[PDB]
Design a protein around this ligand. Structure first.
Ligand code: NA
Ligand code: NA
Ligand SMILES: [Rb+]
Ligand SMILES: [Rb+]
Lengths: 93, 93, 93, 93
């Protein structure tokens, strides 16, 4: 429950940090832009600009396959154990 | 059931309104284009043009993580409690 | 089962046909390109080119919200009742 | 369990190989770029560049509809039977 959500949160944070480091150093992007790219790639939203370095593409494939499940599980647990109870409470008379 | 679908609908509407206000004022887009961006970002479809303001990127990350679960739950409930019964009725002899 | 998959298939086909007609007439795209746009939008994959007509954007929002659930349910049923049994049979000794 | 995950892995690998061959020969892309395109299309992440050949678009539609279910099932099973036990073990005192 609580510990599960917190573990998922920390795991997603570390994964996003790794992706940001990668895309800011290897690819050469700015830190916030690298974070945006990581989020949009792990959330399947997408971006206009794409990687160019072959190492970047390899890491992108592995990163998707490694972190999509984690990010989407974190979203599911955030909606089921954080957003839903909050809405239920703020909808009580 | 009905109240659940309506609550999800109103929540999605308010979230989309917030996103539209943000992207139309801060980013500087037109209202309908801001609504399209919000929908495509919360639905994971995507867009060709991306945010440019750092504040915009921060809000985009938080907006995705806050509204993807809501939008997709609304889609699920719309398909299970609105689309499915309608199809079943219009498929009855 | 079978009838469910077939109904989902026909519904997805009609939805894609409607989207193709729209994007080929109003937007002004070629039929196959309109079909590709409809598929990539209902499947959340994405595209490089985006709508430009305000009517196009309205229809895109409504089309996403109306057909994402249908397309993804069709994919789920195709994987559970068509792909999975086929793989099980072709994996039998 | 184990055999299920391995079968899904091999199926995804073969599907990605087919997509890479297609996009590297017909479309004319480089092998790693074709693999990236296949991954981003089957994972619904997206890409900046889109197909141009009509045959390419037909194959893209069929490829999405044929492999999205497989790729996402592989991701689900990888998260439930590989990532989750590993995290549980590395979180044990
Ligand atoms: Na361009
Ligand atoms: Na683009
Ligand atoms: Rb997506
Ligand atoms: Rb996408």
């Amino acid at each position: 429950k609580d510990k599960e959500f917190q573990v998922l949160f920390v795991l997603t944070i570390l994964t996003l940090i790794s992706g940001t480091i990668f895309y800011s150093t290897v690819e050469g992007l700015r830190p916030i832009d690298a974070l945006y790219f990581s989020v949009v790639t792990l959330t399947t939203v997408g971006c206009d600009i794409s990687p160019q370095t072959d190492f970047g593409k390899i890491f992108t494939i592995l990163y998707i396959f490694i972190g999509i499940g984690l990010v989407f599980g974190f979203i599911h647990k955030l909606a089921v154990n954080v957003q839903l109870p909050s809405i239920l409470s703020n909808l009580v008379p």
